[PDB]
Curated annotation (Swiss-Prot), chain B:
Subunit structure: Homooligomer. Binds to the extracellular matrix protein Reelin/RELN. Interacts with LRP8. Interacts with LDLRAP1. Interacts with SNX17. Interacts with DAB1. Interacts with PCSK9. Interacts with PAFAH1B3 and PAFAH1B2, the catalytic complex of (PAF-AH (I)) heterotetrameric enzyme; these interactions may modulate the Reelin pathway. Interacts with STX5; this interaction mediates VLDLR translocation from the endoplasmic reticulum to the plasma membrane. Interacts with CLU. (Microbial infection) Interacts with protein VP1 of the minor-group human rhinoviruses (HRVs) through the second and third LDL-receptor class A domains.
Associated pathology: Cerebellar ataxia, impaired intellectual development, and dysequilibrium syndrome 1: An autosomal recessive, congenital, non-progressive cerebellar ataxia associated with disturbed equilibrium, delayed ambulation, intellectual disability, cerebellar hypoplasia and mild cerebral gyral simplification. Additional features include short stature, strabismus, pes planus and, rarely, seizures.
Disulphide bond pairs: C3-C15, C10-C28, C22-C37, C42-C54, C49-C67, C61-C78
Gene transcribed to yield this protein: VLDLR
Maturation and modification: Glycosylated.
Segments forming domain LDL-receptor class A: 1-39, 40-78
Compartment annotation: Cell membrane; Membrane, Clathrin-coated pit
Organism the protein comes from: Homo sapiens
This protein's name: Very low-density lipoprotein receptor
Tissue occurrence: Abundant in heart and skeletal muscle; also ovary and kidney; not in liver.
Job of this protein: Multifunctional cell surface receptor that binds VLDL and transports it into cells by endocytosis and therefore plays an important role in energy metabolism. Also binds to a wide range of other molecules including Reelin/RELN or apolipoprotein E/APOE-containing ligands as well as clusterin/CLU. In the off-state of the pathway, forms homooligomers or heterooligomers with LRP8. Upon binding to ligands, homooligomers are rearranged to higher order receptor clusters that transmit the extracellular RELN signal to intracellular signaling processes by binding to DAB1.
Length: 51, 78
């Protein structure tokens, strides 16, 4: 799509829509504007007492 | 401004390191991070258009021309 008024590729940005599995909040992933918690995953390997 | 690399300081005041000059991540307002330096213009993901131009390999044989010689979409390529 021809973009009006543009001269440099850094003047615009585009990204695909994806949500197949939600993302773990991580310092490397920018958040979506709706950063509400979409779900919760059970952290595996419970620490349990044992002898 | 004061910088540590002391190389190719662009008008934005950022010293363009020689690697940064070919880093492919254009940083300064001027497209100064892709000028006057040695680089593999195509990576393993990228297509060599016939005149020596380099572009995303996906653009090859897509029904819609892209690089300036048309090599990504010349019927000879598809
Ligand atoms: Ca750069
Ligand atoms: Ca194409």
């Amino acid at each position: 799509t021809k973009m009006n008024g543009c001269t440099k590729a850094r003047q615009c940005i585009a990204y695909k829509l994806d949500q197949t599995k939600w993302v773990f909040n991580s310092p490397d992933l920018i958040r979506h504007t709706d950063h509400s918690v979409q779900g919760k995953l059970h952290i595996p390997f419970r620490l349990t007492p044992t002898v | 401004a004061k910088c540590e690399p002391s190389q190719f300081q662009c008008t934005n005041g950022r010293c363009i390191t020689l690697l940064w000059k070919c880093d492919g991540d254009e940083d300064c307002v001027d497209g100064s991070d892709e000028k006057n330096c040695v680089k593999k213009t195509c990576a393993e993901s990228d297509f060599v258009c016939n005149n020596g131009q380099c572009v995303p390999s996906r653009w090859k044989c897509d029904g819609d021309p892209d690089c300036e010689d048309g090599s990504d979409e010349s019927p000879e390529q598809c």
